[PDB]
Amino acid sequence: MREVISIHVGQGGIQVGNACWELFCLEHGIQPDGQMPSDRTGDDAFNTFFSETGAGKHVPRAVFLDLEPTVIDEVRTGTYRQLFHPEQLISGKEDAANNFARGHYTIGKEIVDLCLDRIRKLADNCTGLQGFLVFNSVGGGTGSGLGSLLLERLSVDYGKKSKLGFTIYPSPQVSTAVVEPYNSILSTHSLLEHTDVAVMLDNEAIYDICRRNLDIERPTYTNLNRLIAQVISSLTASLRFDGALNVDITEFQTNLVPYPRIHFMLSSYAPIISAEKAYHEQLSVAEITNSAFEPANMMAKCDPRHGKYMACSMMYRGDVVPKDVNASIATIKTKRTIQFVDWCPTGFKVGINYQPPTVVPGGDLAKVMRAVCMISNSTAIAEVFSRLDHKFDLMYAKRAFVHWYVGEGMEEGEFSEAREDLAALEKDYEEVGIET
Amino acid sequence: MREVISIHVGQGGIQVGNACWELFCLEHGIQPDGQMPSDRTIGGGDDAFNTFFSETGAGKHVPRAVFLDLEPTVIDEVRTGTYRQLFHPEQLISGKEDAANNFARGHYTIGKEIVDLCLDRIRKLADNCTGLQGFLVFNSVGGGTGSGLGSLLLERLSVDYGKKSKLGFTIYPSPQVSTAVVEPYNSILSTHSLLEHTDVAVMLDNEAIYDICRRNLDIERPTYTNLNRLIAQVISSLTASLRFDGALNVDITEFQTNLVPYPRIHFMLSSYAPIISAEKAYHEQLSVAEITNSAFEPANMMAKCDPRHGKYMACSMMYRGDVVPKDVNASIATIKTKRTIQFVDWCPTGFKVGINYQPPTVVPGGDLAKVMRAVCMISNSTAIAEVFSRLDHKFDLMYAKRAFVHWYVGEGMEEGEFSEAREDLAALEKDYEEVGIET
Amino acid sequence: MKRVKESYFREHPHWSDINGCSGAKEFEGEDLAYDARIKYQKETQKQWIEQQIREKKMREEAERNEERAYA
């Protein structure tokens, strides 16, 4: 009776939702056609993600948005053609061309109304709506712009419903576009006061994880999407599987957000081990939680050793026992390389689930009986904000590429106020981090 | 629940660790693939393998060791050797560029790129352990990368861990026979480093073992392999009492509490007996008295030094086999009665004896004969100053005309660190000379 | 959510099984099955090792034939 609605906007959001929904279908046993696996053989656990249509198949509680017809048309052609509602894969006619102003003032206005129609058409059906999940690529025009418009409209239309954001900021030095700081800072302004929880998913860190652990020297976007889907499944499995210590979606904001302004945080996962050397180690809960807190395993390119810890939420799925979790937490607390802020004596919220992680054919991970996904709030996140700020100031000093944004209806003063908002956001973190 | 961690850095360290781990695997029954055939053992319960090996949770066993080097030839040889399925793939850390016999290269330029990985590996290994006894390190001192990485690792561990004991088996250059030409410089620098950061050091110079192999084993052309086998036998005899039950059990803690009079003096010589070929074993009886006499006679010293030129500050000897406390007491009494060997004045009793029941094991293609009695002797004597003085003279004759110093100065190390190292050495010989005088 | 399993492995016992439990003598926390369970899990996981490595090898060979054909 509890439902979460996933919003996928932009090419990155679509391509991560593909893996997420493939993982969900495989984990719940639903065929790509949308049916139970043939005439070979319900626990009513699929209700969190799927809904019964009254005759046979299930329909995912998702909506796809894009202005580029290519990805959506190719999805429609693909083998998951019969799974989604035909009018849930909303597609545009012209791309925003990496322009935030286009997708926020010119093109996205003719599609946001239809998206709102579809989203309320999905929301009125569910009775126990837990919240919303949104996936978008920040370094993209239509992605950031449409995400901004959707968040702004959803806030006023719904009020107290929680929203979770899994954004992908540009990497510190490695990227694919040349104008991404602009729409990056603009979307940062848009989401700062509109999203309740933001989870950092920089690509460079995931490339590092793959190279170091999975021993893959030729990785593509598919591996990154599979890892993100595993993170999402580990986060959500408490809402649909029995466990010894349950945590609901409403029980994350109330434990990881000390103040309303500060809700930016990064995630981690463990174990991430290739099958060639996977279980030639014991994978006790102690070493998997040690690997999770290891700084090199951060899913975002940040060093927690450079700042204090605010709060930590970690969830174990498998055959863990609370006493072992307590022992591991005590060991981590006694460890000196990791330090917590003074006004937070206890900073761990633990959840336990008995559903072991599922494996996908053609994947890279190994079939574990134990796993842990940890999301932490720390003051060290400000380094990415600082390095992103420095990049923007270089181009903006010489009016570089500004005429492309001004000519699309955006006022000149937007950049200055966005810079001020980044400055204030940085203002918050260092002030709260210092000892009283 | 008692564990040790072995550290192998440099080509000599890797080649010694190969033989050491082969001997340990053969002793505890683990096959090269890592899967134990499984048995109910013959001594000290089924927990014996816990000291060196850790259960991997799914099948095999993984040694508590880490291998460090910058030249990848030996590492690749190990990875393609018979033990490829034994060691964890990520604990055999290898570099790309060798230090090229340059202590400055191995300590200032291309060391930081490996020390972080090594420290991460050591931390993750120590997390598994519960009753970690201490660390064992093996390194060739005459090699640039070996000496530099060992010194930097000791510097890092001294502040990372502290109270955990660290043991060292160093192989000093021989008095006249040596391979390289610039080894005095890095030997002096490495001693200057390790004197302040090594709890216990053991001298393992080549020539003594060379002469031992030439004399006792009747083999004219052995190689480094046999030397490594002898060193592995010494290590196993030293650490057997930790994992095998005995009449008198001596821990790692009961070495520094009975062998080092002062923290400044911790340099020791080793000796092992009996070691003789199976051809000559057909004749003599191999009693405890004769084996301890062979251990004490100077020509059997594992280091090229003569104990007759100094006093014995303390001696540690561990017996394995079917030895009896009464007979070892008889041997000790005879040794004390003998006038050729003399002890320092302020040491009325200078023996710490340990007894273990398991007789030594044998290695295929070996040279040592399987015997029913053995003893390994560790002695601390003031005669150690002679090798330090000889190396000081060699280094001074090196440095009189300022040769080979351009590389060291240009690699980042300042020119005159040799002066400070020489001062530390001279203080060391002065300390040894002043300690041994009668009250 | 629900707590329908006391632990990951052993389910809730039958009512006839708990004959006493008014006086604290049987706690069913002493396992009496830990060693055999973990021993079985060892080989259970070893089989997964072997399988996954097999599909992996198949994947690299399938990759290699492609570059051979292009050559």
Next chain:
Amino acid sequence: SKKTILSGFMKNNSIVGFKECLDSQLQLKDSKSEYNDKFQSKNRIHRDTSIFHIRNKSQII
């Protein structure tokens, strides 16, 4: 095959909560009424006088 077998005819001609009451409440024999428990018993000219006092507390209803 859980709620997809549904039809209009089946629902509107089905009673869900007002079907027959289950057992443990059926336990009244319709014929037996009052004036038949005692005035239709059988009656005696010489009764039995034995009465027993048990060492068990009387159940309360």
Next chain:
Amino acid sequence: MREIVHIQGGQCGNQIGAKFWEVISDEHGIDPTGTYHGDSDLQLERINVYYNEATGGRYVPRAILMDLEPGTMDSVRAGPFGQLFRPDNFVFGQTGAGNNWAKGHYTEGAELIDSVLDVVRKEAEGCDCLQGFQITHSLGGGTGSGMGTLLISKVREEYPDRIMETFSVVPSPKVSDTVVEPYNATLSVHQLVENADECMVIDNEALYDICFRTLKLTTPTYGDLNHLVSAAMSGVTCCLRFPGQLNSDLRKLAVNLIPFPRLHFFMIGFAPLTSRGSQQYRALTVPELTQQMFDAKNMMCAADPRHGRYLTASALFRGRMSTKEVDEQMLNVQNKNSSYFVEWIPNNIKSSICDIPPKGLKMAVTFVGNSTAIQEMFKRVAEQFTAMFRRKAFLHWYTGEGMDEMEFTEAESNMNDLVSEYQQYQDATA
């Protein structure tokens, strides 16, 4: 006669209640279908204390199950003996509290407790001669501590003369699972001191110690921890259901344990508890039971009783035993440890005897002790509260639901006030 009704709230409260009813039912020989199959009159003589009789000769517990989320009572029906409870007694919300004291005490629990208050009124008035209430809940959670205490406040104003009993799981800093743990724990003690007649504190840290050290069982789990608490709960009211040499109900314990009205926080323990490998070495005797009973490591609380002075103590012995042996041991322990007992009250131990031991046992005893060392538990909770509240961390949810900072300041002061006025009797001299 003199029967009690049971109330359990929250995920923690339901789990403790479920194991408790399994213990009681098997003690009285009641099958999961409610049909008695015991062996004696005494198993049926006073069964009305805990059970209500319906048509068909079946017995149903008079327990009220309450929570703000439907998952847990979907689970309680999935375990053994899950079909005993009357389905009408189940009350549940649709959203839950989410570890927010304000949400469960002001917004959601307040509008939902009107329903569960009605069913309690139905159960309480139905019985002939009520004795009181007993409540099991956790102070570290949202709905358990928040909406549970409001029920305690509401019920007290309606039945002032009835004994109110509580079993509170006080959160510990050692085994910590929630970041907002100190706030709601501190607030609940404020409401609990003014209403509960008897409060017995329970700590998960202490329960883990007993399993690891005394029982030495390999894998502790909540199934084992709940079993220990359930055994202790049954031993307190054992004499209320069975004959004995010296009878004592809940009211008699309150009179003989509470010197002053604001000192009603006790620590409980159970004996005997032995491991499987040590069962054939011990000897079950009256001297042996009292030796383990007073042991510091045997208490179910994190507070060490050797850091303070006992005020009063109570022991309830079960089984057939001689009265003289019981009385002399109580005198003996008091004489040998005169430094651990407050001196201005002579003979501050009470003894009770019940002739029916727990099934499968010959002798057993439960201990309830009012000690001045319980102030340690509040002190460590207070320091965590004042550390977080100085920087106003994690406060906008409590403030965002109508609560103001004056409530937090007043709650801290009164809890601080209790600690100061509870130590004052430790240093009292005659």
